[PDB]
Write an enzyme that holds these catalytic residues in place. Structure first.
Site, mmCIF file in Angstrom:
data_model
loop_
_atom_site.group_PDB
_atom_site.id
_atom_site.type_symbol
_atom_site.label_atom_id
_atom_site.label_comp_id
_atom_site.label_asym_id
_atom_site.label_seq_id
_atom_site.Cartn_x
_atom_site.Cartn_y
_atom_site.Cartn_z
ATOM 1 N N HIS A 269 -7.030 -40.075 5.801
ATOM 2 C CA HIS A 269 -6.802 -40.884 6.991
ATOM 3 C C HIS A 269 -5.827 -40.203 8.026
ATOM 4 O O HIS A 269 -6.082 -40.265 9.227
ATOM 5 C CB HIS A 269 -6.421 -42.362 6.590
ATOM 6 C CG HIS A 269 -4.945 -42.626 6.478
ATOM 7 N ND1 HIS A 269 -4.014 -41.625 6.263
ATOM 8 C CD2 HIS A 269 -4.242 -43.787 6.536
ATOM 9 C CE1 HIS A 269 -2.803 -42.153 6.217
ATOM 10 N NE2 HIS A 269 -2.912 -43.463 6.368
ATOM 11 N N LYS B 254 0.811 -1.215 0.000
ATOM 12 C CA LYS B 254 0.000 0.000 0.000
ATOM 13 C C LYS B 254 0.843 1.262 0.000
ATOM 14 O O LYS B 254 0.589 2.153 -0.811
ATOM 15 C CB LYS B 254 -1.055 0.074 1.111
ATOM 16 C CG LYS B 254 -2.116 1.143 0.745
ATOM 17 C CD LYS B 254 -3.332 1.265 1.685
ATOM 18 C CE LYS B 254 -4.371 2.200 1.060
ATOM 19 N NZ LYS B 254 -3.868 3.580 0.773
ATOM 20 N N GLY C 254 -6.478 -7.430 5.018
ATOM 21 C CA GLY C 254 -5.596 -8.308 4.282
ATOM 22 C C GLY C 254 -6.209 -9.667 3.998
ATOM 23 O O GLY C 254 -6.083 -10.259 2.886
ATOM 24 N N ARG C 255 -6.938 -10.154 4.995
ATOM 25 C CA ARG C 255 -7.586 -11.421 4.938
ATOM 26 C C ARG C 255 -8.911 -11.436 4.223
ATOM 27 O O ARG C 255 -9.612 -12.458 4.201
ATOM 28 C CB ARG C 255 -7.742 -11.974 6.344
ATOM 29 C CG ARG C 255 -8.292 -11.055 7.386
ATOM 30 C CD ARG C 255 -8.333 -11.738 8.789
ATOM 31 N NE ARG C 255 -8.949 -10.835 9.738
ATOM 32 C CZ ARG C 255 -8.352 -9.806 10.282
ATOM 33 N NH1 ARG C 255 -7.082 -9.547 10.037
ATOM 34 N NH2 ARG C 255 -9.024 -9.036 11.102
ATOM 35 N N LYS D 215 6.640 -8.194 17.282
ATOM 36 C CA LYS D 215 7.506 -7.437 16.402
ATOM 37 C C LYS D 215 8.352 -6.509 17.186
ATOM 38 O O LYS D 215 9.511 -6.310 16.817
ATOM 39 C CB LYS D 215 6.735 -6.643 15.319
ATOM 40 C CG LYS D 215 6.242 -7.501 14.112
ATOM 41 C CD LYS D 215 5.369 -6.647 13.141
ATOM 42 C CE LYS D 215 4.574 -7.545 12.146
ATOM 43 N NZ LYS D 215 3.606 -6.732 11.341
ATOM 44 N N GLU E 152 10.176 -5.265 3.846
ATOM 45 C CA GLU E 152 10.025 -6.689 3.573
ATOM 46 C C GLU E 152 9.845 -6.990 2.044
ATOM 47 O O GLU E 152 10.694 -7.602 1.403
ATOM 48 C CB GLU E 152 8.825 -7.196 4.424
ATOM 49 C CG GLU E 152 8.960 -8.580 5.027
ATOM 50 C CD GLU E 152 9.325 -9.626 3.973
ATOM 51 O OE1 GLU E 152 8.409 -10.312 3.416
ATOM 52 O OE2 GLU E 152 10.546 -9.744 3.694
ATOM 53 N N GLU F 214 -7.280 -15.151 12.739
ATOM 54 C CA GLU F 214 -6.901 -13.753 12.845
ATOM 55 C C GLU F 214 -8.105 -12.797 12.962
ATOM 56 O O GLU F 214 -7.979 -11.686 13.425
ATOM 57 C CB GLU F 214 -6.013 -13.380 11.673
ATOM 58 C CG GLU F 214 -5.377 -12.012 11.802
ATOM 59 C CD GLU F 214 -4.505 -11.634 10.603
ATOM 60 O OE1 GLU F 214 -3.286 -11.785 10.698
ATOM 61 O OE2 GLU F 214 -4.987 -11.153 9.570
#
Lengths: 561, 561
Positions: A398, A215, A281-282, A526, A221, A367
């Site tokens: 199984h 964004k 985000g999710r 963090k 990262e 979350e």
């Protein structure tokens, strides 16, 4: 505040305790022996409005009679679930702690019902971006978009993280049969450029676009991975003596709002696809974050995927709770999680293409609702989100089923399946579906001491060796399952299954009184890590943490390189 | 019998209830404030005897004081855990319901301590097969083994199922850095030949061996996939006009005991690798079932992997419970699962190569201890195996961490990590380990109302908007974690981590009094499915099940093709 007590004191919640206390131990089987139409009465079918496709939930294999069902619906009413959902759908700021709207339904609002936020209709924006993704994806897929050497594009590497990676992965996987087989998609997310270096020695850079999801477009990262890609591109042109002029613009695009920062990177902002704060985000695959999806299955199939979710949205807004599929789904879940004390939720999709679904739902559900406080700012008085797990029923079918059948934890199981198959090869689908229906049956009916005794005599077993073997081979039964069926796993069907779980999470969060749409839980980890980092150096001893962290940091420091 | 009551009435179990009742609510942090050496006292380090490698468990981040620790060790003694483990290690028939030995430790018994079963030392057999795998893998890897066209081999497709697939996958993944990069391995397990057809249009058949895993070598499931491969080979030679004479023997091998049935398939029985009844599927990677592993990392690295497990075995047999790593691991787990009422167990490995570990452990743990009755043939009086979940901490390192930190379920977390890194690229490893240590710290210490208040004033937050935001951003702390460290993830280290979990499962199963080594739980599902299968036909209506299964089978029948 200190502690809520609100929900704990609703007439509807107390009434549900009594019914659990009273009817709790009745077998699932007992509820069918009374009503010969229980199946019909405890199932909802949604018309998907295309190709005889549908989405059907059979929640009949559960410890729920009519009184309990009545009480659960009473709860949803007493708690204002429908009215909360309407506010959310209208662009009100239901994400109270971040003071923003929650408008993933705007991203798939096909009818274009105006949704007004900060004096503007967000649908100009949604539609504008969709049309921009249309024009761009059409040109990549047709081969008209050419890399710096003049070649068409055959690879898409998506650079992002967490939620901006799991949706696109689950969905492009879920819908391979609808995908352009020709162009391959990769999804880099890991911090160390291991994956990025893997994909770089695999793709011919002359033939590959990289999507950069960010964004602000600064996020160290993903911009680190972006830079590796960019540096390799410049390197590769340099060595092979190809002009770099306009090169990055031909091989990179952005999902961002930061127009000038994207442009600085060398990207052309005609290829900046915006998304907004009210896309969590999710909940983002439906937005520009889904660009790799649309590249893969094309614009029409993406619209179908969006439409599937919207049909789900309308169903959920318009239909009264007894017959409202995501509401019922949420209620049978609350019944297990909050009265039975079931900590978990398995999701078992009997389609190999859905193998990534359970992971996506872990994110989505855990979350959102893995929360300890109410909006009202009291501590929750009751259990919130369950631990979500699962795998696709094709393979193994199984591994951990042993425990779901003969272990000591009641685990709510959503089995998800399709009537039609994307290939008529032998009887592979029938065999699969025989297991699909058989697992839910087995769970409910079990196998009693006498059935096993009658079975073991027939084996011709010793008279004495039989009696002590019986318990090992018995099955309690009376274990719950939801059977969710779709006619076929098409873009539209998948879109509706995703939206269903989203509204399920909505409903539960409203009932428990939490904010389903913030995620504060990651901050501590963090902050403590940025502080531990300067301390990881050779020979360093730390003393400013607790003894465990200290000794661990200190073992690392003395033993490292 | 009806119900055990045995364990429920041990002095040691009752004593542990009182201690839970009394000390249960004390913070994890409180136990460190009292003893400044708690870290050391609540950790065990195993010397792995090569390259300064080690395996270390720090179980100090838990709700356990010295009294509780004393009681947990008392429990293990009172229940004969050590003596049960010795019987198992001696080839006694501890798998009571199947009346067989459980001897995965024989597969890695490097010292060759004679283990006697049915009047024979099984180590002749283990060693014979190992030497046979040695000679075979050496010849594939050197390129001396040639396909029907004269070419060396570059692909290995392993055909199996469930346990005979998950180990090999997890391990070859775990140890890519030790693998021959040159030859690629595939793992087919799914019933529909989708995966098999995928691999067939990918591999050049002239250059590929297929491993067929099947004890009887009749198993319709894997022999169907085997036949596809065989039919494609014959097809492919036919079209390209190449002799089929001796072809299958050059491109297929077996893991089986059925000498004549393998030979009929066209396989050369010099290339039949045996394994035995006392190798359970979920304990089989160490045997001939691990042949793809040994092909991949070679014989020496396989011996190292075996040795790692054996060091673990000796540790576990020889060391008294207070200082016995798998015992302590099992005990802190029993403490959460049986007194706290924790239904789950997360396993979070901070190494991308271990991304398949949690799945392997779901199988290992849940199928072993997901049991409802005791050997004594009473119903269990207490909770057995927990639900196992997890993912690798490299990627996402957040999806479901929200819930582990701020949700309402205490979830035991095994964080697993390495001091050394298989590559010195930037500071990717340090950043990773900073998170590794920080997550366990964050979980224990949390972040209190006042810390957040002091933090939010500094943010320059409104005086009123601050007070109702505080609870959202607080962290209870006092949530448990185990930090497991290894020096480096080498074959030997991996072997020890696997064996550790195996003995952990051993210890728990002995304490609860279950048979950890049978798996009866799958039978019901299969029987009901073989019976549902003839009924899946167009227009068919069934009435011989319960109404739900009936209506589901019936919807499928009326809506299908």
């Amino acid at each position: 505040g200190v502690t809520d007590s609100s929900l704990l004191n609703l007439p509807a919640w107390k009434r549900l305790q009594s019914l659990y206390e009273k009817y709790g131990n009745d077998s699932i089987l007992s509820h069918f022996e009374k009503d010969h139409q229980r199946f019909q009465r405890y199932s909802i079918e949604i018309d998907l409005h295309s190709d005889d496709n549908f989405l059907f939930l059979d929640y009949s294999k559960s410890h729920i009679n009519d009184e309990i069902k009545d009480a659960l619906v009473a709860l949803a009413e007493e708690r204002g679930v429908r009215a909360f959902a309407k506010a959310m759908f209208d662009g009100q700021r239901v994400n109270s702690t971040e003071n923003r709207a929650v408008l993933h339904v705007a991203l798939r609002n096909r009818s274009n019902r105006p949704i007004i936020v900060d004096g503007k209709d967000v649908m100009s924006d949604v539609n504008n971006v969709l049309a921009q993704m249309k024009d761009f994806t059409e040109r990549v897929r047709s081969g008209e978009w050419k890399g710096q050497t003049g070649k068409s594009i055959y690879n898409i590497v998506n650079i992002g993280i967490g939620g901006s990676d799991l949706g696109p992965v689950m969905v492009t996987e879920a819908l391979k049969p609808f995908s352009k087989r020709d162009l391959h998609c990769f999804f880099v997310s890991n911090v160390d450029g291991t994956h990025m270096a893997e994909v770089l020695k695999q793709v011919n850079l002359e033939e590959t676009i990289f999507i950069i999801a960010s964004k602000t477009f600064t996020t160290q990262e993903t911009l680190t991975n972006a830079m590796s890609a960019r540096n390799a591109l410049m390197s590769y042109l340099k060595e092979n003596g190809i002009s770099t002029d306009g090169a990055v613009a031909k091989h990179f695009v952005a999902l961002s709002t930061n127009t000038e920062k994207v442009r600085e990177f060398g990207i052309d902002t005609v290829n900046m696809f915006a998304f907004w704060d009210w896309v969590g985000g999710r909940y983002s695959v439906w937005s520009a974050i889904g660009l790799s999806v649309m590249l893969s299955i094309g614009y029409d199939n993406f619209v179908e995927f969006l439409t599937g979710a919207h049909v789900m949205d309308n169903h959920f807004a318009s239909t009264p709770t007894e017959q409202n599929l995501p509401m019922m789904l949420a209620l049978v879940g609350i019944w297990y999680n909050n009265f039975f004390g079931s900590e978990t939720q398995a999701v078992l999709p009997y389609d190999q293409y859905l193998w990534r679904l359970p992971a996506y739902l872990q994110q989505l559900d855990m979350e959102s609702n893995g929360k300890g406080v109410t909006k009202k700012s009291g501590a929750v008085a009751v259990q919130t989100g369950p631990i979500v797990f699962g795998e696709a029923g094709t393979n193994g079918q199984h591994a951990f089923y042993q425990l779901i059948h003969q272990g000591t934890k009641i685990i709510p199981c959503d089995f998800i399946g399709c009537v039609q198959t994307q290939n008529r090869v032998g009887d592979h689908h029938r065999t699969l579906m025989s297991n699909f229906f058989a697992q839910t049956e087995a769970l409910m009916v079990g196998k009693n001491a006498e059935e096993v005794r009658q079975e073991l005599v027939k084996s011709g077993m010793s008279g004495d060796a039989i009696e002590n073997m019986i318990p090992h081979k018995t099955f309690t039964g009376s274990r719950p399952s939801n059977s969710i069926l779709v006619n076929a796993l098409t873009p539209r069907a998948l879109g509706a299954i995703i939206a269903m779980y989203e509204h399920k999470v909505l409903v539960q969060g409203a009932i428990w009184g939490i904010n389903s749409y913030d995620q504060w839980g990651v901050e501590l980890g963090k902050v403590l890590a940025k502080s531990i980092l300067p301390q990881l150096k050779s020979g360093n001893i730390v003393s400013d943490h607790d003894g465990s962290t200290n000794g661990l940091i200190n073992m690392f420091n003395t033993r490292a390189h």
